Point group: C3
Chain length 276, copies 3
């Protein structure tokens, strides 16, 4: 019943008949994910024969200081286990939340993926690890608690859950669409997005540090403050829609390199793609 690890998705694509070399104190969840593969505790490693798996980020710090690590490419030959939110060169799943290329995030939103709060996360999105995404409890009852249900019997729970499924303010993200976090998004430190009231973080939206987001963010909007407010937009409204049609975040690696000057210069991006 174990969900598919981020490590499992990498090994499925890059192990290539090698043996996994565990770098660090192995854990029960790691051993569980490493069952269908040949693995051993790492000593002397070779990218021809071994794929290095550092258990903790502390273990990766140790591996990347070692001389043997210089022959190992990120993702292609090594990876960290305890980093479910780490970026990848391909489109992955987090639990069952699709996550695009070069998109990383922390543990608060990994849990938000587990809670069914997020529908999907786009490409090239940078989310600070300390960002958090939680829902609201019911606000229309005599109690605000959630774990009182542990004391509810079958009859008391049927009538509790029935009201939640009808609450139009979506407690615990009920009866609402899971939120989509677009591509080219930046989320600052200590940011919070209410999962009960937000369904869309637009493409290109920039959420400032310490911002509390209670509503949808328009595409390429910059929001700051408690509560978050639109301070500026990244580009004009004509480039905003042109961006939403050109969709550079879905290019190939060869196309990204072939349009580097357009990605580096928004003015040149317009002179190249803003055809009418």
């Amino acid at each position: 019943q174990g969900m598919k690890t981020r490590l499992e998705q990498v090994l499925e694509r890059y192990l290539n008949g090698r043996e996994v070399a565990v770098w660090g104190v192995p854990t029960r969840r790691l051993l569980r994910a490493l069952k269908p593969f040949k693995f051993h505790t790492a000593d002397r490693v070779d990218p021809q024969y071994h794929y290095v798996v550092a258990v903790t980020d502390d273990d990766l710090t140790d591996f990347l200081s070692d001389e043997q690590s210089k022959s190992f490419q990120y993702a292609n030959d090594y990876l960290t286990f305890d980093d479910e939110g780490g970026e990848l060169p391909f489109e992955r799943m987090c639990f069952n939340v699709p996550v695009g290329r070069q998109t990383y995030f922390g543990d608060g939103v990994v849990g938000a993926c587990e809670n069914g709060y997020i529908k999907s996360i786009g490409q090239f999105t940078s989310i600070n690890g300390t960002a958090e995404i939680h829902a609201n409890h019911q606000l229309n009852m005599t109690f605000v608690s959630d774990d009182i249900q542990n004391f509810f019997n079958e009859e008391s729970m049927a009538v509790f859950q029935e009201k939640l499924r009808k609450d139009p303010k979506h407690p615990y993200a009920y009866s609402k669409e899971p939120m989509t976090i677009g591509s080219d998004v930046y989320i600052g430190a200590h940011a919070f997005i209410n999962a009960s009231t937000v369904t869309s973080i637009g493409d290109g939206a920039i959420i400032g540090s310490g911002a509390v987001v209670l509503e949808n963010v328009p595409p390429f909007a910059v929001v700051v403050g408690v509560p978050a407010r639109i301070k500026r937009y990244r580009f004009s409204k004509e480039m905003i829609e042109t961006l939403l049609r050109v969709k550079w975040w879905d290019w190939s690696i060869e196309e990204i390199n072939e349009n580097v000057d357009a990605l580096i210069s928004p003015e040149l991006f317009m002179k190249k793609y803003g055809s009418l």
Copy 2:
């Protein structure tokens, strides 16, 4: 007395602890008064499974063996001092009511003597923080400078700290009482030097910085925290404080679930008249 110890004193029932995960020195110290082993084949009739990390419990509950293990009754996580429980428990020496949970920041607050008790059915976000102020009336704001103080220098340092009316390090003030039916959001902050109570039913929004007492059933948001609304009318707040549903038995909670679900039904039933 650790949280695992309080459960094992209650629900182990002569079984043997099954350690799901790599054991730590502190867990090995707590499991000393019982027999234990590394979990392989587990049966809830023979074993109480104890997951070391939250990552261990996730692996255990996804195993086909956990299908007959009940929460707290048959299993528990050791590195979850702030996890909820079906009976009133102690966090260090801070009482905590039933179905109430918090994070490690609040755990350290309990350890620092900042909290007097935490009520029933209270939901505290793990990223919530509770710290006190340093001394602000002296030439230095540092605390660890006292590590360079000798026996005579700290006699006068500690002397003025306890005289300080602003309660540096929560000095000369009652510890903080967090009521029942309380909700506190993520990244919230409560100042242990200037806050003595969070009322019953109080709701602290995410990202809110609480510097003064929150009234019962008040909804506070912002930096600093300010009251945005009250949960119920004044009359229901009076009756909610006389009834105290959070102290009901499991029986009364299930019997009056209709009153717990609808505030208006609660009002006619337990209201004054």
Copy 3:
């Protein structure tokens, strides 16, 4: 690049054996390779330097009755605590940190990213404080890891605009930030490494404050964004504090002026300018 533990063992081990309290990690064994270590059992400070692997391991040790004879730093230390205070000036990565100054893992990462030039003495930084920089905001994209798809030539142009940018994305083309002495920083506080270069001596950053520019010495900043609430002392006292620099005193001098450090009024009647 010595660790916090390596710095302490080179100075206080004194021919003893390090006794490891807890399950040893890969990075701890590597730090302990030049020393004589073994699993802790029965420990004596005349014989052993107890090393606790995790914060959770040290709590277990100090509750044990064998810890009653050990002293902090001199006789025991925690491994996973690069931001923990020390009774001497230390090096976090390659960032000088003053005596009795502590921070959390976010600021340790800020030292690793080169965002911090130095951190003063007797500075108290909450563990949930953060110091991150801005990505480029004058481009078509805000991503950083998109550069993992950049080839050799595209990387050149990208890195070129970054060093040209006057707003200092990723703290480029700007001086690393200085954090003064006798500074306090509340929980959940954030300092932008792209636009800040100095946290003045004696500054106080209140909880939840978003500091977007330099904080003067002895100013108290709060809010989102952070603005000056008050100053700890008068303008004349700040100027005397900046010349006296009590945070550079010897342990003897600190005790000899414990009355001047406790009462600001006594500090001025003794060090105030003529």
